[PDB]
Design a protein around this ligand. Structure first.
Ligand SMILES: *[C@@H]1O[C@H](CO[C@@H]2O[C@@H](C)[C@@H](O)[C@@H](O)[C@@H]2O)[C@@H](O[C@@H]2O[C@H](CO)[C@@H](O[C@@H]3O[C@H](CO)[C@@H](O)[C@H](O)[C@@H]3O)[C@H](O)[C@H]2NC(C)=O)[C@H](O)[C@H]1NC(C)=O
Ligand SMILES: *[C@@H]1O[C@H](CO)[C@@H](O[C@@H]2O[C@H](CO)[C@@H](O)[C@H](O)[C@H]2NC(C)=O)[C@H](O)[C@H]1NC(C)=O
Lengths: 54, 175
């Protein structure tokens, strides 16, 4: 692959919502970019992303 | 206009009548002067207020978040959104524009009617106690002091009182 910021390797990221009292089980023998931090969320509604230079 | 009064058989309005939309101008021995008719001005200001408030009130306003959330391989949905977005703007732009054009005609005809109705109100009070000059004025066949003019302006003109004095002046004009 073409170099982007010096790198020809790529990093592909994935996400999920982990319900209260569920568990997430990772198994990897290589190439794993593991979590250290995660984020607590409660969502009571929606909007969108605005594009603005202000 | 539709009702023939404003910019019709009454040519031009009155800079000198500052205190209302429609009213009177009297002229007698004591002096001349302007007076706003408050009943018909207040009615009209009630109607036009109500008109304006409804055009604004009746609009239903919901929360909407509108952005560009589709990527470079979702151009077909992005175009569905554009057709939708653009479509509603065409609708609202046409309705707003015509709504304003159409209610602007009705508001001016309303005023025309209001003025014609006031003229007819004085007409019906005075009957033959006054000549009808046809430019919106009445020439009285009797002497009409300030308290008489007030009686015309507040809808309590006493035709009987002046009726005799008037017909003697009409009989007299037949010479
Ligand atoms: C995620 O973890 C929760 C809570 O786990 C509990 O606390 C942790 C700090 C550890 O000490 C765990 O070992 C401990 O279980 C799990 O939910 C819990 O499951 C256990 C059984 O695995 C429930 O215990 C039961 O209790 C009832 C009576 O209350 C008995 O009848 C059963 O025999 C059994 O002992 C426990 O109540 C429950 N707790 C809550 C608050 O839900 C959860 O299962 C786990 N994730 C997954 C994927 O299972
Ligand atoms: C309408 O105007 C007339 C004329 O002024 C009022 O009647 C007179 O009121 C004055 C008080 O300024 C009295 O001095 C007279 O005695 C009244 N004259 C007559 C013939 O009644 C009258 O009050 C007004 N009416 C309304 C409903 O506005």
């Amino acid at each position: 692959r073409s170099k982007v910021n010096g790198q020809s390797g790529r990093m592909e990221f994935f996400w999920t919502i982990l319900k209260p009292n569920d568990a997430i089980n990772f198994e990897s023998n290589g190439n794993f970019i593991a979590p250290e931090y995660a984020y607590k969320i409660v969502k009571k509604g929606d909007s969108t992303i605005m594009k603005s230079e202000l | 206009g539709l009702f023939g009064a404003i910019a019709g058989f009454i040519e031009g309005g009155w800079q000198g009548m500052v205190d209302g939309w429609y009213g009177y101008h009297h002229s007698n021995e004591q002096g001349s002067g302007y007076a706003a008719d408050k009943e018909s001005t207040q009615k009209a200001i009630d109607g036009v207020t109500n008109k304006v408030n409804s055009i604004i009130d009746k609009m239903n306003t919901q929360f909407e978040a509108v952005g560009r959330e589709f990527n470079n391989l979702e151009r077909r949905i992005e175009n569905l959104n554009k057709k939708m977005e653009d479509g509603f703007l065409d609708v609202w732009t046409y309705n707003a524009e015509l709504l304003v054009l159409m209610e602007n005609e009705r508001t001016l005809d309303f005023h025309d009617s209001n003025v014609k109705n006031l003229y007819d109100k004085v007409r019906l009070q005075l009957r033959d106690n006054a000549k009808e000059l046809g430019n919106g004025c009445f020439e009285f066949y009797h002497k009409c002091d300030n308290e008489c003019m007030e009686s015309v302006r507040n809808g309590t003109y006493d035709y009987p009182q002046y009726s005799e004095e008037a017909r003697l002046k009409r009989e007299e004009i037949s010479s």
